[PDB]
Amino acid sequence: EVLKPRTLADLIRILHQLFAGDEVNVEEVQAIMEAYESDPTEWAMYAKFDQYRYTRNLVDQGNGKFNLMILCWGEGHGSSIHDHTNSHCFLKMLQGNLKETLFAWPDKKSNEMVKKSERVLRENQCAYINDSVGLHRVENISHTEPAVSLHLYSPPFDTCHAFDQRTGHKNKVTMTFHSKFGIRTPNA
């Protein structure tokens, strides 16, 4: 019953329809993204890794409605604890596996941060998060294999906050692209 995109190209086309409006059905988007069968032949042009940290690779600008990007996690690479600047955020596995740890939001008080949930995203699985759901950290589970994920943010955003697990203090972080449309960006 779920519309199954047969290619990354089909999926992008479907996403343009699902975000053409002002409403967006989260479970519907989640199911269609999950239904797409990851095919490395179709997204290898975006799979540009860096030795020391993960990379963000823009695939499609979604007519200003959303950003679609591919994130490449080297061996052992992970993110900090961050928020998502009041946007919808979908992340689907394209290769390997990521461990998502959901964190609760900190008070004004300084305290160790509390884990709310911990899981591994399976092959082709699509997960969903926004700021009302919680904060999270994402990491490659493997020290011998990469992980690759497909992320969709609506509306688009280029700033977020990173959180110190020990205190809950946060810092604003401007997010950058490693590449856009298969083309490396100036200055990593």
| CA distance linking residue 83 with residue 40, whole number of Å | 29
Cis peptide before 155 (omega within 30 of 0): yes
List, as residue ranges, the binding site for Fe cation: 82, 84, 136
> What count of other Cβ atoms lies within 10 Å of the Cβ of residue 137?
20
Q: Which long-range contacts (CB under 8 A, 24 or more apart) does 177-182 make?
A: 177/56, 177/57, 177/58, 177/69, 178/48, 178/50, 178/55, 178/56, 178/57, 178/72, 179/46, 179/48, 179/55, 179/57, 179/58, 180/57, 180/58, 181/58, 181/59, 182/45, 182/46, 182/57
144-166 residues labelled b (16+ CB within 10 A) or e (exposed): eebbbbbbbbbebeeebbbbeee
List, as residue ranges, the binding site: 82, 84, 136
- Specify the amino acid at residue 12: I
